Amino acid sequence: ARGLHAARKMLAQRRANKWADKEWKKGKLVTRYKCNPLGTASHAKGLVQEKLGIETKQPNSGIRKCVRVRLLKNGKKITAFVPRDGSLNYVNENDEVLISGFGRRGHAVGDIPGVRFKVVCVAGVSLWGL
Amino acid sequence: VRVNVLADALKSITNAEKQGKRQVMIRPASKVICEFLNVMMKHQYITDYTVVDTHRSGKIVVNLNGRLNKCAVISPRFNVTLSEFDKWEANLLPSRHFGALVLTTSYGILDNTEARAKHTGGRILGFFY
Amino acid sequence: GRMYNPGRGISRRCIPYRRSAPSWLKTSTLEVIDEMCKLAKKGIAPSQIGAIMRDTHGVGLVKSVTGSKVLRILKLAGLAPKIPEDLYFLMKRAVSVRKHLEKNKKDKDAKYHLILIESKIHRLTRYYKSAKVLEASFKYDANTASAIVS
Amino acid sequence: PLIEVDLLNPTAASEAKAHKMKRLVPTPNSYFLEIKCPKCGATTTTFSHAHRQILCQKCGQPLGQPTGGKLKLTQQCKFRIKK
Amino acid sequence: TSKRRNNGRSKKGRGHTQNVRCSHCGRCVPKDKAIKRYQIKNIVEAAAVRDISDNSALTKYKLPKTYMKLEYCVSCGIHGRVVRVRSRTDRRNRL
RNA sequence: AUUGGAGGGCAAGUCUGGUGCCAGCAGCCGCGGUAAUUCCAGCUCCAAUAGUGUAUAUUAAAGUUGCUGUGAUUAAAACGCUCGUAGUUGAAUUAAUUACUUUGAAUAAAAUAAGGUGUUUAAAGCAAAACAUUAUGUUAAUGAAUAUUCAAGCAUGGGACAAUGCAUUAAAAGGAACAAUUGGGGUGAUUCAGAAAAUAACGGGAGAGGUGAAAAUCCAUGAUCGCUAUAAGAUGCACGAGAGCGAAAGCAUUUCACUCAACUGUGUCCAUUAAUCAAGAACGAAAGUUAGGGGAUCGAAGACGAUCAGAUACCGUCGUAGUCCUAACUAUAAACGAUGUCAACCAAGGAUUGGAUGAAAACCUUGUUCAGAACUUAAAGAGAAAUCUUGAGUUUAUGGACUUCAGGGGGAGUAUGGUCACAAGGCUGAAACUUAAAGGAAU
RNA sequence: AUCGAGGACUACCAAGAUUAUAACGGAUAACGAGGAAUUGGGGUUCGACAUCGGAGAGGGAGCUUUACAGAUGGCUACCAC
RNA sequence: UUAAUA
């Protein structure tokens, strides 16, 4: 339909064909409010309950230290990295932490086995300056 | 079926010049086809043409002289406002000195240069470099 | 190409570049009209009427002699059939195929071609109604066409 | 064709070879003729590609048989082209 | 992709052809795709033709031949050395 | 003067101390197993700078959402095929509205653009002054014309291209008619053939099948083998082809009917009746289902015997449903040319099928031309290439008309919901989660 | 009845109205617009919030005064405080 | 005739 009066089908075709966009459909359908532990929020707060260590993928070797967090807004249970060197010793238990994303990689990112969230505060200032 | 006779004619002319042919033949003749050729003659892109009468919307034979790079028709003839001229030329023409559009207006079928001079817009027909 | 199959033939007739009657033709319109008039009374299609004049009377084109077409001549005399000739012949074929189909129920190619023929009828009937040739009350029906076509 | 001829002045031979429709100005290949009867002297004018039995106007020495593209005149029927 | 322009068949203007049976495998192959070879041989081998002609009860009886048409599937044509695998540019030769 | 970094993307160290596939770094590729350019530090310099990193989201990049502007042979993607309504698009042609186009009217500012103005520049403000040394005078000083501006509405000049209006011709558009044909096109009846197997009778008298070798099995109640007779089922060799017909699936003994379609021929008729088509409708291989008939051969299941480590398989023997016909369902295939339908232009050939038309006396050899299935060459056109050329060409020099489909790989044509079917199943058809590749052509 | 047109309401009469050009439904983390961010052209996303228009005062509902209110920094009743 | 795996 390349005609001069064929604007109904041209407009209607883009409506249907736009739903095949994986990156665009995901941001429109109702899943960011139900299937996202973080939600729309950039950062979230939760309580540390368990200190975990996840083995890396096959071409790597070592244990990725991380923590298990119970968020306040929802109540879900997640896993959060502990950035740079020796920062797990700074993290106590049953305390509030600020959890904030990662890049997004191929979804998962840098503690390898399915972790997608990194602890940026320990109540304190920073699991940087600390 | 033949929807646009002008599209058939301009494709015949462009094909003939890519092969270096001297003259080409167009089976269905129209007023619009004749006007498009007249515009192309005024810019000396075709030497001349003759129209044979077959009592059946007769044929046109066009003489070409190594100058018509490409003449093409434009599908549905958009209503070109006078302010939309340079938007069309920037898209369809190679530069600001070489080619020329073709528009059908109430004052006849004219290229973009003299339609701008006559201060009138209309539907766009085609172009030629 | 043809409407319903991928066949593509260009078997046509070629009208000469002479809209007037040829010099050797001498019969006036009076003989042409009455000769055509007598043929119409015999129950002959307008397409066949012109052929008979061309083959026998040497009047190959009637518009070149009388200035008006065969159908226009027949309408003026009132001898034009109520059902247009091309539509009438199409309903004659649909009836004939249907009659064969009553005894041969297993013929699946005749059922297909009957469907194509009836689709043609609904295309022509729609056109002639927009041209006011057929009154809007006209409608093609299998139970009825057997009698009017007969 | 790579080699090209004039498209306005085709030769007499070239136009004759082409299809009846693909000429410069299309022309029919048929004609009107009259046939002198073998039985009598009358000449019956008829189409070249007649699609029916051709009878004399006097009697009916049938003068031609329609055969899918041109009249099959009898061997004793002489004709001339009506110009 | 397409190793052959004709897809290895001989069918151009139709949609279906009947089946034939491989003379060695018994496989079903379409009539066009089958490798058809013709054979015309005498009923007596070249060694025994002299022996039969010596002691015969007929004046000048001419030894008859046997005629039969053999059709092979692709697998049993290649394996039986009826046809060989050819070069990429020599596949096109049809003589 | 700080923030981030110094393997690549990305500017910057193949400097020195520790660490030894650990700790870790790492958005991606990846570096680390004791000589780390990537870890932790020291020195140095790289970028920006009163800013600089991180996380989420919008925009550009994305010609990876396409009107400008994509892709559909093989990478993902042309409905199995035809008919068909709305929708979209519609041949040439003539010396009242609408649409289109040009000017305006009217229309809140702020904001955007833009005119002036030394807030010391600038972002600002719409004021201040330039000089009159200014009360005086420019002066009754500036207010940017401040322009917008799309979709509607109002007025005006034009009527080329278009729609609804209410008499041209005869399209290498379409339809109809006629003449001669073509057709393994379809339906019904009729009709021929002998292979295999069964039976009847006779001869013969010890094997026969089958395999790589065998075994299971058949045979003295006379098998295999040979001749002669029969009656059903099924099938339709050789002719049989890069040949024909059909919308596709598909169609092969010869006769007679009933149909149908197409090509060619035409100074025959109509006069736009056309193309593509959501919804909808006919036909749709094989398998499968229901109920009758038939039940020869072969044979999913099954049962034996071999082989093997095992063999529920390949090999051999037997064998049920099925294979065949009638009526009704089912509606799927690598339903393939993996290539939608219609239309125009288009390099050299040789041959073939069916016509028309000259020559040469139905058949055959040649010239021309129309239609059909194909084939060969290309230093040319296209493409990632293979390859395509009766297009997959005429496309960044991007627009002839219309419909369908695709958006990294999986999950998955799965779950659920709806609907069709007696059932198997068919049509529509996700998400959570997971992952840096999966894939195409060629060396 | 209202300031007033009007099924706005009542009585009788008729069977009509919308829909594939998407009605009736469902969602919105939806007040609309002037406008904002980013853009070669085309566009995409945002706009609670300067200004214009609409609606509300914890949830409905019913009213008083008056030229203007179904007012809530007015009143009455029910629910939650 | 048989010929599985790293």
TrEMBL record, chain A:
Keywords in alphabetical order: Ribonucleoprotein, Ribosomal protein
GO biological process annotation, one example: translation
Keyword Cytoplasm: no
Gene3D superfamilies, A to Z: Nucleic acid-binding proteins
GO cellular component, one term: ribosome
GO molecular function: structural constituent of ribosome
Entry similarity comment: Belongs to the universal ribosomal protein uS12 family.
Protein name stated in the entry: 40S ribosomal protein S23, putative
The species this protein was found in: Entamoeba histolytica (strain ATCC 30459 / HM-1:IMSS / ABRM)
TrEMBL record, chain B:
GO biological process: translation
Claim: Ribosomal protein is one of the keywords in the record: yes
Ribonucleoprotein listed as a keyword: yes
Keywords, comma-separated and alphabetical: Ribonucleoprotein, Ribosomal protein
InterPro entries: Ribosomal_uS8, Ribosomal_uS8_CS, Ribosomal_uS8_sf
Superkingdom as given in the UniProt entry: Eukaryota
Gene Ontology cellular component list: cytosolic small ribosomal subunit
A molecular-function term among this protein's GO annotations: structural constituent of ribosome
NCBIfam families reported in the protein's UniProt record: PRK04034.1
Record PANTHER family: 40S RIBOSOMAL PROTEIN S15A
Family statement: Belongs to the universal ribosomal protein uS8 family.
Protein name per the record: 40S ribosomal protein S15a, putative
Species the sequence originates in: Entamoeba histolytica (strain ATCC 30459 / HM-1:IMSS / ABRM)
From TrEMBL, chain C:
Pfam families named among the record's database cross-references: Ribosomal_S13_N, Ribosomal_S15
Alphabetic keyword roster: Ribonucleoprotein, Ribosomal protein
Gene Ontology CC terms: cytosolic small ribosomal subunit; nucleolus
Small ribosomal subunit protein uS15 N-terminal domain: residues covered: 1-59
Protein name in UniProt: 40S ribosomal protein S13, putative
Spans traversing the lipid bilayer: none
Signal sequence region: none
InterPro entries in alphabetical order: Ribosomal_uS15, Ribosomal_uS15_arc_euk, Ribosomal_uS15_N, uS15_NS1_RNA-bd_sf
SMART domains in alphabetical order: Ribosomal_S13_N, Ribosomal_S15
Similarity-based family: Belongs to the universal ribosomal protein uS15 family.
Source organism of this protein record: Entamoeba histolytica (strain ATCC 30459 / HM-1:IMSS / ABRM)
Source species, domain of life: Eukaryota
TrEMBL record, chain E:
Parts forming coiled coils: none
GO biological process terms, semicolon-separated: translation
Domain of life: Eukaryota
GO cellular component, one term: cytosolic small ribosomal subunit
Gene Ontology terms, MF aspect: mRNA binding; structural constituent of ribosome
Keywords, comma-separated and alphabetical: Ribonucleoprotein, Ribosomal protein
Ribosomal protein keyword on record: yes
Region (Disordered): 1-21
Biased composition (Basic residues): 1-15
Membership in a protein family: Belongs to the eukaryotic ribosomal protein eS26 family.
Protein name in UniProt: 40S ribosomal protein S26
Source species of the chain: Entamoeba histolytica (strain ATCC 30459 / HM-1:IMSS / ABRM)
Full-protein positions shown: 2 to 96 of 144
